[PDB]
Design a protein around this ligand. Structure first.
Ligand SMILES: CC(=O)N[C@@H](Cc1ccc(O)cc1)C(=O)NN
Length: 282
């Protein structure tokens, strides 16, 4: 039942929350024993937001490998992503250790450091060229190379140095800036173009390790980014573009990360992001 038609009847009835709770009721439930251990109390920004043990990204170290990061592996779509929370003052060195280990090209951010007068994440990248950051706990160094500031996003070039191998790599900061404080973006137009812009970079390609995407919790705004890309990828690919079930995509993803897609407005907006993007792939 096509995604244009469904909506329509979803509007016609207005039962977004009603659609939305059923997915919440049909979603995966798996253990999260690692997250919950006591020595990890400080690596979680939220007590109710936890990575499942079976899909948890692990940090390459034998003492403590824990981070609130999971691997969403999409079989069909031949696409992979890591969802993580906004880093904390105690996790910064862990976020970049992850970027390294995993061999990612890109870092995507759907949020500002300050929203509603309070802190959404740590300031974790260098704002000035001659002002480099060193992550002592994890022996890496990061340098701001260049900055492309535009209306809805900014793209930054960074240099990540594994101070232990002295090897260096180039990472791309894709930062979306205009998402509103309350609600959802008033028009999917800008979220989509930024999604094409991230693909444009080569960051969501198999030729690198999965992309790292985050917002504050690592489930909401992050979930729309991946639900939509994957659905778009799926439409190009199948005979029947019409075949794409957005609820079905979401529950598959939900098997790898708890609560992807936080409110009924995001579900629909996720729906308009798919619906509207199809209109170029073609
Ligand atoms: C008709 C309706 O329920 N609209 C939503 C708001 C909405 C707008 C754009 C989005 O992309 C997503 C959600 C609403 O009124 N919710 N209360």
């Amino acid at each position: 039942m096509e995604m244009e038609k469904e909506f329509e009847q979803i509007d016609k009835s207005g039962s977004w929350a009603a659609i939305y709770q059923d997915i919440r009721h049909e979603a995966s439930d798996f253990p999260s024993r690692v997250a919950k251990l006591p020595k990890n109390k400080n690596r979680n920004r939220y007590r109710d937001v936890s990575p499942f043990d079976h899909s948890r990204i692990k940090l390459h170290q034998e003492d403590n490998d824990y981070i609130n990061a999971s691997l969403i592996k999409m079989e069909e779509a031949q696409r992979s992503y890591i969802l993580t929370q906004g880093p904390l003052p105690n996790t910064v060195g862990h976020f970049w250790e992850m970027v390294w280990e995993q061999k990612s090209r890109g870092v995507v951010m759907l949020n500002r450091v300050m929203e509603k007068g309070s802190l959404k994440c740590a300031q974790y990248w260098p704002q000035k060229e001659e002002k480099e950051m060193i992550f002592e706990d994890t022996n890496l160094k990061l340098t701001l190379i260049s900055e492309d500031i535009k209306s809805y996003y900014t793209v930054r070039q960074l240099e990540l140095e594994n101070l232990t191998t002295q090897e260096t790599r180039e990472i791309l900061h894709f930062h979306y800036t205009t998402w509103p404080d309350f609600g959802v973006p008033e028009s999917p137009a800008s979220f989509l173009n930024f999604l094409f812009k991230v693909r444009e970079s080569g960051s969501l390609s198999p030729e690198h390790g999965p992309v790292v995407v985050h917002c504050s919790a690592g489930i909401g705004r992050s979930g729309t980014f991946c639900l939509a890309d994957t659905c778009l990828l799926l439409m190009d690919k199948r005979k029947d573009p019409s075949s794409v079930d957005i609820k079905k995509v979401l529950l598959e993803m939900r098997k790898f990360r708890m609560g992807l897609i936080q409110t009924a407005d995001q579900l629909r907006f996720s729906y308009l992001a798919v619906i509207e993007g199809a209109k170029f792939i073609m």
